Amino acid sequence: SMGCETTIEISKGRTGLGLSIVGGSDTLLGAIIIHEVYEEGAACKDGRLWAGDQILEVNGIDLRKATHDEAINVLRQTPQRVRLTLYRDEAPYKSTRL
Ligand code: NA
Secondary structure, eight states: OOOEEEEEEEEOBTTBTOEEEEEOTTSTTOSEEEEEEOTTSHHHHHOOOOTTOEEEEETTEEOTTOOHHHHHHHHHTOOSEEEEEEEEOSSOOOOOOO
16 A cells, blocks of 8 residues: 565676566556566575565666666666665566466
């Protein structure tokens, strides 16, 4: 009913952040969303990031209205320590293989 914001700093590993991203202002989501947190990646080991979280900002760069490609460029260009500001909607983010 009320969602919640957090800011966390993730130190990258060999595989980077360890996540995949979907969405963008150019999409049905209208936001940059974390689709998956990969096992054994940096974001998993940190424990705090969840699929479905929205990336609002990265190291002082606003991604609230970014297109998918704008966001990837931003994320690609980040340093070793990535300060992410996230919004967690109460909605679940569901993913099923069949
Ligand atoms: Na966003």
